[PDB]
Design a protein around this nucleic acid. Sequence first.
DNA 1: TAACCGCCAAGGGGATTACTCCCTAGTCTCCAGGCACGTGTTTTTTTTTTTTTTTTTTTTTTTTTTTTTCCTTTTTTTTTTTTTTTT
Length: 49
Amino acid sequence: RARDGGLRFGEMERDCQISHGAAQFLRERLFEVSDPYRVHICNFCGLIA
DNA sequence: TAACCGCCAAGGGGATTACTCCCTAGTCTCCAGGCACGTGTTTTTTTTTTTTTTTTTTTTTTTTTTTTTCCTTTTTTTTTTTTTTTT
Ligand SMILES: [Zn+2]
């Protein structure tokens, strides 16, 4: 709380959300509101360009 | 005390001569086990793959949340400047 940190979306949260089977909440909590990024990738090599 | 010698007596069987006979020496003639040559099938050796247990390695240990405390080098060797003594 002193560093103003968010809650821990742990393993069993992903387990019970897979049990509910709603993919959009998983895509929100684990990609949209945690650490989104955009990278550019070469098509032939498949690595970071 | 009976070995040994001398003397005498008796008899038993090996040597001798002749007749016989029969078994083997010798000589063909057929054929068959004895032997020279080739080889085997068990016996030992060597590989080969597995087995079975032991040892080693590696990975694991429910989740979330909130406060402090200590530390986040250190000695040890080398260098470089400074100070003092001498001619
Ligand atoms: Zn490329």
